[PDB]
Each structure stands twice: as structure tokens, then as C-alpha cells.
Design a protein around this ligand. Sequence first.
Ligand SMILES: O=P([O-])(O)O
Ligand SMILES: O=P([O-])(O)O
Ligand SMILES: O=P([O-])(O)O
Ligand SMILES: O=P([O-])(O)O
Ligand SMILES: [N+]
Ligand SMILES: [N+]
Ligand SMILES: [N+]
Lengths: 378, 383
Amino acid sequence: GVSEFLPEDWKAATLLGRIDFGEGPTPVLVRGGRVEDVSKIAPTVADLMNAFQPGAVIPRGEDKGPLEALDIRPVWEDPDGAAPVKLLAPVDLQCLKAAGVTFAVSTLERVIEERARALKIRTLLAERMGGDLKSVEPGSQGAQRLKDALIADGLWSQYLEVAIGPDAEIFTKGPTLSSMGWGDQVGVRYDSHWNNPEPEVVLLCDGSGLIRGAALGNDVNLRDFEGRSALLLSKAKDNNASCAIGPFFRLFDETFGLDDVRSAEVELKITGRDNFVLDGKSNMSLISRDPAVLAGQAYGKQHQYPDGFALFLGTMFAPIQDRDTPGQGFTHKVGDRVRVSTPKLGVLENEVTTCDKAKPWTFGISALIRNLAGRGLL
Amino acid sequence: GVSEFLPEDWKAATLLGRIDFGEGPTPVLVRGGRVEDVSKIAPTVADLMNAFQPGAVIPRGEDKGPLEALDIRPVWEDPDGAAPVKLLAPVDLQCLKAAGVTFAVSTLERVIEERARGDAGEALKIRTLLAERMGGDLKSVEPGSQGAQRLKDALIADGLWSQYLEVAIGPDAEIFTKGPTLSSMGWGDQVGVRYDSHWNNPEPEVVLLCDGSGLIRGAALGNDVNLRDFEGRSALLLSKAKDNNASCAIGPFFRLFDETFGLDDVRSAEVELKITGRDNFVLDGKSNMSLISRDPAVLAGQAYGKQHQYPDGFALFLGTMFAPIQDRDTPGQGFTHKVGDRVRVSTPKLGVLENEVTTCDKAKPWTFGISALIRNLAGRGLL
Ligand SMILES: O=P([O-])(O)O
Ligand SMILES: O=P([O-])(O)O
Ligand SMILES: O=P([O-])(O)O
Ligand SMILES: O=P([O-])(O)O
Ligand SMILES: [N+]
Ligand SMILES: [N+]
Ligand SMILES: [N+]
């Protein structure tokens, strides 16, 4: 069932992704429900977005027929890759960037509720800032007053700095071409004991720093590493198969735009072999920094991205549901299936294993170059 | 002129890098003091390293003449790029990785900036407390050992523990992405400090070249341009403190390991830092790689393995050996960059990496990425 991970109105949508039809990764546009191989128009997704700015007509690629007729199978049904067609992550040459601590209200309230083990705390804090904590504006003067009041209470932390300060937390999620897509295995380090998915929306940005579309993401996260030291953030975020993006980027058009991202309800479901089930659901409406503002902090006068970039927008999901150890929260088991979904983008589903058991990352930039050159696409 | 930034024995060395002769980036070897265009052997440095294993002789490329005869000029003598030949960063497709707090002088200054919340005006008082309290304890254990665990417990009981000490002496080194692939500056380039940073510094380092099998192939010098006010405000701003336009420099070339040069030379390298400014500030200092807390091969083995691969290879900054605190403008306020600063990182076996500092917004933007490289190579018939 291919149709089950697509947006509800996907035949009216413009989807952009990558498919291996048997000869290597191929940029595809899905329009009118039909797949177009656009590799002769541009050999990569990054190249396509740079060749056709917003507002430009993208010509038609080679007809590959209806999308739901392609024999696409996920890894948990097709371990050996018997399928004649493989769906890939919809990024290729883009840098993989991620924002974190973008939902500042829940960060603040979790700090307060940890201190309370609350009314008096929220009262004095809101009066120093000059308004309700639910209205905190990161990087504002009210946020500076809140910062100082929190330093005075002994509640300040480096996480609150990126929650309400002028600079958002933005980091490199993984190397270019290393992302997993729909139906792939994702990896948690074998030496991580406390880890979780992070259900997110991922923006697609072109080499001019313009937002072009959005996909779902799983920012696989190793809590025990980051908890020992924030300087292990990279090691908690960037390992073999630790990034999943997909199934397609949905491009902005008459049917879909950034305002639909701004109000998207993102759902998470984790299903284990042990019959564990976890559900979580969170609205992008509560994000404390606008997606365009986050993109503008990643890209501007002081950082460019000539091949474009993808940007995870962060999450307010908290992995506090106990699984097997009371008090310590969630952690993955091998074989967990993780679904991240939202109606306008479809469903990103992956299966969890450890980083050493997932297939190694072998198809890098040089591998792509040789593949594209051998096909005459350059 | 050109020999001033090369190894003292450079005509006997094997140097690997990238030059634009006027048609685009070209992998080159410098052997016998002569430049070889090896683009017909492999179109990129990353491909060259994946095609020839360590110890295998790389065949001769196309002779381009003596290196010192090429009209190579740095940006402070050629601001508009009139020179017909340009030396580039010696990396192309490699990921740019960096290790942190591998030298005790850096570890102490990280804890100081953390306690100051990135405020340079607080550093003097905090340094006065912490240098005395923690002096001589960091290098008393091997990182990741049982001894290091007992030291951690002592420091926690002292009220001296920090998330930076966790990566200084714990089992997991701090390794992060310094910048995107193809974004590095090289010798003679401008490097960029963010214009909204007011507490920043160069970070001289030795940079390993590793291939797609994780093997260490050679070494270059590096400058990990760093923003203390950003990282001090929050370690979650590490990436913003490290990764901005033109914030990474590697060069002048990678010296490949052979009979004249090996990892043991990397392990004992004396590195010199010189900073000069338009205000006639001068800083000059030296330190030795033997002070590193984790062996370079151990750092490379933490970066690459069963849980992270790098099919195009990677460069690895080994960690800064300097943390400048010399007062520039105000007594007790320490150092920060000004536009026009010249930073020279040098060691006898590798030469000199020299850059001119400006702000990120004034440096030329990063425009030549992966697609540009692919198009350039394809158009030259090199694929
Ligand atoms: O290219 P857009 O119109 O989908 O953003
Ligand atoms: O807000 P900025 O300085 O990250 O653009
Ligand atoms: O922790 P640092 O040394 O990478 O700033
Ligand atoms: O990791 P660094 O900041 O010492 O280069
Ligand atoms: N588009
Ligand atoms: N920024
Ligand atoms: N460091």
C-alpha cells in the first residue's frame, strides 16, 4: 500500500522526491497523481530547486505512470530489496540542518514544574517579563527581563538561553547524502540506553535561502549522551542512519503553503515487538519562533548554502512515557516501528535498529557523481 | 614569496592540495618541489585518497612546473584576485569534523566562558578562581579511564564539575561538524568572525586527512575560528559559535605520510601562533602536540567506525592548543579580533597557514558548492 503514506489530497499536490528505478537515484515530481522523472531537466533535487526559482514553471519530466502503481516496499516487508523500485530520502545535495528548543513555553514550564516538585514562581516571573509566560517572545526585551529573573531564581540554564534568547539552537543533523527516507531502518547507537524519536516538520530550502516545501522528519535522539554533556549534542544526533526525512517534500502551490505548516498537527506513534504502543500529538501553532524566522537564522549574510538545505523545525514531544524502567522514560527496542504523520504531508515510517546493525553509509558524493556521470545526466 | 609558507623541507615532501589554474579546482601533488595536476588520475582529492591505499605510490600527474614559479598571491596582497592561479583549501568532498577540549588550556577557558555566560568582562575573576582550584588536575588522568572516573567524582564533590570536563576526561570525546562540505577557506583567504560576536579568537590546530576507510593519510594546519560569547552563552550554540561564512581554514596543503613524515611527527609538532592587527597588537606563542589529551589515532577512531562512516573521507581538527587571553584594549578584558587581523599558524613540517580576519558578512559569500564542483568537473571532461 503506497497510497497509505501519502497526503490525503496527494493527487492534487505537487510532490518532490527521489526514487531509484533500477539505475540510481532519480529526482521525481509527482503532479496530477503521476510520477515524472525530471533527471534530464536537472540531475538532482538541489539542482532542480536552484534551476527553477519560486514562481517559475517547472517543465514536465518523463512519465513514469501513477505513483500508487509503483512496486515500492518498506524494509520490514522487503528486507533484501526485491522490489524493482526504491523510494529514497527526498534530499540529495542539501545540507541537513536542525533547530531545537523551538517550543519555549513547554521548556519554561517543565523547568518550573521541576522546581515545584509553582504559582509563586510563575507569578514573579511573569511580572518581571511583563506578561504571561505563554506569550514569551524569544529575543525580545521581555525575554531579556525573563532571563535576568530566572538567573536571579537559580532557574537559568543553557537550554533556556536557546529557548528565549536571540539565537535559536541550530546544528548540523548529519552529513550531506546520509539521510534515510520512508520505509528505511533508522539507527540508535548500541551504547545509548535512553533514546527516542523526535517527530518534526522539515523545510526544504533552495540555494537562494527560500523555503520551497516541507516533509516529515524523525530527528533520532540519544538523551543519555546529551544529558551527560551538551557538547555531546552532535554525538546524540549524528550517527549512521540517525536522520529520516520523507516521504516526499510537498511543494508550495495553490493547494499548500507555509501557513499550512504553521498550523500542522504532527502525530507520533511508536509500536514495539513487545506490544508497547506510544502516541503523541503536538501542534506547530505552539512553536515559539516562526519557520521563516528559523530559516532566516540559518541562512543570511553570515551563512549561505549554495546547494540549499533542509531544516528540521524542532518538537515539543517529550519522551517521558515509561516503557520497562519506572521513572526513566522511553527508550527504543530493536524492531520498533515509528510513524510521524500529518494530513497534508502523509506518513514517515521507519523501523529502529542499532547504528552498527543498519547498513553502513556507502553512497556519498563521489558515488552520486559517478552514477550520474555514467547515465549521461551531467 | 611562495616558499615562505611551505614546510622547511618542502622539496622533499609530498604535498596534496587543490589549485585553480584558471579552469576550476584541480587536485594537485607537489613532489620534488614541482606541481602535478592529478585530475586525470582522480578528479577530486577525496577520490584520489579512495583510489590509492596508504603506502601505495600515486603515479605521476601532469607537470605544472615548480611551485614557487606559480603566481600565487594572498588576499591581503591581491584583494580582487588578479593572480592567474589560486591556491584553495586542500579538502573537497570530505566532511569537516573537529574534536574539542583535547588540550587543558582550552578546557579551562571553556569552563571560564561557560561560568561567565559568554561575558568577557567576567572572565578575569572566574579565571583567577578556577586556574588555582583546578590547576594541575586535568592532565592527571587518561581520558576515559577508571582514574578519570574517580577524578570526576572528586571534582563533583568539589563543586567544580562541568559539562566540558565530561568531554575533556570522560570516555566520549567532543566531536562535531565544523562546517559544510566545500565551505573551507585555505591559505591566503579571508576568514570570518560574526559581526555580532564581541569575544572571539583563532584556534590553531593540526588537521588530519582521513580517507573513506577511516585511515589517516596526512596532515595540514587549521584555524577553527571561534566565538566565545556565543558558546559561553550556551553550549547548544556550539554550531553557531563555530560554523559561519568563512569560519574554517585548512592548509596550505595536506602533507602525506611517507619516509619524510609520519603520524609520530604530528604527535610531536611544535605549533606557533602569531596574531597581528592594524592597531599593532602582536601576540606570539607556541605549544606542542604532545600535550594533547587523546592520541590523534584515538580521536580518528572515535569519529569513524561501526556507528559512523564517511564514504568520501573526512578532515579532523584535533583541537586547539591555544586560548588567547592577552589583553588587547582593556586591562583584564583579554583578546578579541578586529577586522584586518592577520593570523599565522605554523609548524616546521607543515608550513604556514595565514589568513586575514574580517566579519562574516564582509567576506565573500559561499557560492561554490557541490553542484558547482560537479558542473565544473563534468564540463572539463574529468568525470
Ligand atoms: O517552488 P515552490 O513554489 O513550491 O516554493
Ligand atoms: O537573528 P540572526 O542574527 O541569527 O540572523
Ligand atoms: O568545546 P569547544 O572547545 O569545541 O568550544
Ligand atoms: O574543538 P575546538 O574548538 O578546540 O577546535
Ligand atoms: N517549485
Ligand atoms: N544567524
Ligand atoms: N577546544
